[PDB]
Design a protein around this nucleic acid. Sequence first.
DNA 1: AATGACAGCCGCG
DNA 2: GCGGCTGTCATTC
Length: 902
Amino acid sequence: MKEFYLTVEQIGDSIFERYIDSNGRERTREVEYKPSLFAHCPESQATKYFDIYGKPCTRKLFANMRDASQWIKRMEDIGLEALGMDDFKLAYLSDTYNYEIKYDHTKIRVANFDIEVTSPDGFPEPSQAKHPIDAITHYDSIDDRFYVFDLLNSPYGNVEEWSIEIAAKLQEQGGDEVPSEIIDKIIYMPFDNEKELLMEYLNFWQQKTPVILTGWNVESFAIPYVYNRIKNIFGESTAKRLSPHRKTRVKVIENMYGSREIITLFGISVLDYIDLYKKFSFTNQPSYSLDYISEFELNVGKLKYDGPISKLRESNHQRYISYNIIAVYRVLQIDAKRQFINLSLDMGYYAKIQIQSVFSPIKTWDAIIFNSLKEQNKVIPQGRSHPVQPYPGAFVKEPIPNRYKYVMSFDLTSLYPSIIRQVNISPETIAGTFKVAPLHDYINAVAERPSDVYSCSPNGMMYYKDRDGVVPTEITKVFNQRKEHKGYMLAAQRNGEIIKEALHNPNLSVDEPLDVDYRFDFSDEIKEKIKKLSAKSLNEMLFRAQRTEVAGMTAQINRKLLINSLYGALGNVWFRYYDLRNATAITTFGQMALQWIERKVNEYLNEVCGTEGEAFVLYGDTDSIYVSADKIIDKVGESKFRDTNHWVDFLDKFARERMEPAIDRGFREMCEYMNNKQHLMFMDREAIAGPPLGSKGIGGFWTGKKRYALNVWDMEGTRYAEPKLKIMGLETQKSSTPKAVQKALKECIRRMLQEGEESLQEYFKEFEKEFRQLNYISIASVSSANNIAKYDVGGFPGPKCPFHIRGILTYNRAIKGNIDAPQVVEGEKVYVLPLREGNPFGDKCIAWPSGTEITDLIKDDVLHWMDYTVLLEKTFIKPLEGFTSAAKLDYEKKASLFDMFD
DNA sequence: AATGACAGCCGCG
DNA sequence: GCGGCTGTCATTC
């Protein structure tokens, strides 16, 4: 087996590495790594090393990392560049694994854990770990077992042991409904006292020290807690045992509102699933509780237990422990689906970095380029420090608020990475600059052509066309790799077809599968064995095919991720290859591109429609343009179409056959104009929207930049059975909006786009007529309560007190002096309802804990005093008018016309 | 980032 | 008594 690393750390002058060896054993070693760095040297001094600028460098080998560091400070002092990889861990890795890392995840220990802490006085702060750890469930990937540690006695109660039998039973039979798939993988361990528990858990941790440490919120609660808990009860000494190198640091991070500390365990890679999810799920969620996310992903969350959590251990210790077991399992299921732990490993080993550095694009790319240049005996630039200066972004067309019956959109392919390749932008391919004309000038092609020797950008930058830069080369390398593994896609999948096709008539014999790699499309030169196959073959020849075929999907998706994160690093001052001029070159060029094609499209459609100066592109944005098909559908007449699907195809054909060509023609012109190194500006029809043929629907509308809704029928070739609404930017998409209301608003938008004015008006009247019968929770708006105290002045609203926070105050006053009432905690979200003047709460509104019913101590009055009128007006009506006004509809009959003036 | 609820502040017999 | 702004607090893209 080819050896691969697990974790690497630098402690002093030595590197500590944990790795899987030739025989698959987990080993660990200390290495007095001797790093090498480079300095510029005179021409005479012949060497094999050169910097990305072609200048000669001499390799300086140091006695130990300390010296290398000190040397860099010195050089820095004097003012001379110190070249080479300053992050020795990365160099050590690159040196020790001078090849393509092939890792066997089966040998990598991935732990998934969660603990429980009974705390009667509020959230158990991890920085203090005041209360005992009541329970711990720790799942190990190597053993595929859940190890449970149950504390049977604590100052908060003495409970009985947990029953695996009771746990497996059904809810109705008084069970916990712990899945049968894990019911056998549970190892229970009850403890008489906490000290015995923590001590045995620490031992357990030494026998099975995690390589990858995950869980949910584990790095901001579980680890810090267990760390400080053991620290206080035994001493920082024994607490350090949590780290395989007994070295730990307390990192303190200051966020949006405050600050929180987290523990760094040298020798372990912490991949908190909440961060994993947040970074790779690519989806904004109203809440990140494991409960919400699990429900969303797995369609099921966590045991609906009764009573508060603080008293759940005492009241029902049975449930309490099972609740902890299933909490761990859930994350494991979510990962079983999303596969983020594996995606991380895959990306880490490809870039040869610490697996946790997956969260940093800067670090990921820095390594990817370092290793690439090192193979060519080139030396990376010294990371320079730059001033965070803002810079020009993308261009967003100000759209004319209105309805748009027919719309067709086109997107540019990976604009930024493409622009970097087309123009050939890189820190070392900068040729020079040139007199810059106003951007509009270049968009209309009236400004003087920049140059005829160098590739240019509308911002004034010129790049060499001869040599390919370091950056564009790496992205292309990645771009290619993508289509390389996606070439292995239909080479193990699409090919796994001669297997399911030959599976209908399996010859009767006892033969084994044709043991040969599938990655490559099988041929009749060896795979000729089609019928000779039996039943245990064909059926086995589509496991491997599909087993690896998917493995490709991991590479393709990961390549997409680096490709999309590259611009990220590039426009970031801490990046080794950042350059304000290049960052601007990229965005400015894009600015031009989108508005250039906008011009071209408008010119084309106007000519082919025989009109003059008609604006066909109604809205542009970064890399998308939306065209109004109205004029096109009219050149035929809606009457000439059989049904809806009829004009959809018409448009699809028109776009592909007439527009696509016009567009590419236009961009080639632009590439020549800027004398770019390569034409890579590609645009594809994306969506086709409009109303059902013969309906009174308006098809779509725009409120303003980034705010629209379209009734789409075909998306990039894929035609939907039922039209899907594409809504970007409106209330219907904000969690702050009451559920029942996002519902109604969605229905409103729908009836507007597909049914028409009269329909909307009908639904409006009905919704408003049954508003008062809706459940008080579904009609309340939700908000995040930050800095509650900030505006608290004796339980009353201070100056400039936000409406929802002022609501919190009225609630605090309403329950002040009754510990049995749910507390509104800082940072958390709260439900908010208005209250009709003269209410016993003394204020205009009242808020309470989100996701929960309001305490019955005030429930009956809040229900009697809530202001339905105001509630409706502010949450429902106001936003609706925002849509209808734009689309020129009325959601109510008899509305004067002179409203839309002044 | 830009679009939007609330807050108080100015302005005009 | 309530349009015109600028200053918070929020939310999603």
